[PDB]
């Protein structure tokens, strides 16, 4: 089974560059603004990263510069949007089947 199908999208609006780690912030749409929280795992078109911080509707995620090259995340650029999907480490209704 695999779908990689994204529930919603995000608008890159600001980049935060830290010589220790790179950070990117997107604009969360109405149906992703309700529910998502910092420390959550957001997959951008299916690449899971964690939310470093939320700037109101915006959300900054963490991205290592070398990981950015290793993945195709480096392709992101502000003014563009992303396919964003909510990911969770554990949940109440895990009981599969």
* Partner from its own copies, ligand RBF, none contacting 6, C-beta within 5 to 8 A by type: its own copies
Count of residues near ligand RBF by CB under 6 A? 12
User: Does 47 carry a binding-site annotation?
Assistant: no
- Beta-carbon count within 10 A of 17 CB: 10
Give the N- to C-terminal CA distance of the chain in Å, as an integer.
15
d(CA 50, CA 74): 16
- Neighbouring C-alpha atoms within 13 Å toward the C-beta of 5: 3
**Residue span binding ligand RBF (CB under 6 A) among the ranges 10-18, 30-38, 56-64, 75-83:** 56-64
Q: Which of residues 65-94 bind its own copies (CB under 8 A)?
A: 71-73, 75-76, 80-83, 85, 87
d(CA 58, CA 29): 9
* Partner from its own copies, ligand RBF, none contacting 45, C-beta within 5 to 8 A by type: its own copies
**Residue span binding its own copies (CB under 8 A) among the ranges 4-12, 14-22, 31-39, 50-58:** 4-12
Mapped onto helix, strand or coil, the DSSP state of residue 30 is helix
């Amino acid at each position: 089974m695999f779908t990689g199908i994204v529930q919603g999208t995000a608008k890159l609006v600001s980049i935060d560059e830290k010589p220790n780690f790179r950070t990117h912030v997107v604009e969360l749409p109405d149906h992703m603004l309700d529910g998502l929280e910092t420390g959550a795992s957001v997959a951008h078109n299916g690449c899971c990263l964690t939310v470093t911080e939320i700037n109101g509707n915006h959300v900054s995620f963490d991205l290592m510069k070398e990981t950015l090259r290793i993945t195709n995340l480096g392709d992101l650029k502000v003014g563009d949007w992303v396919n964003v999907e909510r990911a969770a480490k554990f949940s109440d209704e895990i009981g599969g089947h």
